[PDB]
Design a protein around this ligand. Structure first.
Ligand SMILES: [Zn+2]
Ligand SMILES: [Zn+2]
Ligand SMILES: [Zn+2]
Lengths: 15, 125
């Protein structure tokens, strides 16, 4: 529950 | 109790047929986080664990079912993703169904998929 995977969220999520 | 798709995360990222249709796998929720970060979970195939990002109906179902570590799901709509510049692996899950709530953990000490492929740079798609 921290900020280490902000990369995954930023780049991905949108398709 | 229920049979997981053992090792399937390895299949998804080493076999192009599986990569192209990574659905039907039965996985166990390995961890969840306590706003879009809520939707990033860890899942286990019984041998490996990996990160999964829930989107769309899967994100809605995460809320409506109070999805937690130990829950067993079947992924219905998904696509793989590799963040190649960070060597991070993710399964983007757009829909799943609940198989069993709060099942005994199948493998408490699994291998993180990203660590396995860090040592297997030639096998990964
Ligand atoms: Zn941090
Ligand atoms: Zn951190
Ligand atoms: Zn090997």
């Amino acid at each position: 529950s921290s900020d280490d995977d902000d990369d995954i969220l930023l780049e991905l999520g949108t398709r | 109790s229920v049979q997981l798709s053992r090792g399937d995360f390895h299949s998804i990222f080493t076999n192009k047929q599986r990569y192209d249709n990574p659905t039907g796998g039965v996985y166990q929720v390995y961890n969840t986080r306590k706003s879009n970060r809520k939707n990033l979970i860890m899942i286990s195939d019984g041998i490996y664990h990996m990160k999964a990002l829930l989107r769309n109906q899967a994100a809605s179902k995460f809320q409506s079912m109070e999805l937690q570590r130990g829950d067993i799901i079947r992924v219905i709509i998904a696509e793989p993703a590799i963040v190649r510049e960070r060597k991070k692996y993710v399964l983007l899950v757009d829909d799943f169904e609940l198989v069993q709530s709060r099942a005994d953990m199948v493998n408490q000490t699994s291998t993180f998929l990203d660590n396995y492929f860090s040592e297997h740079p030639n096998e990964t798609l």
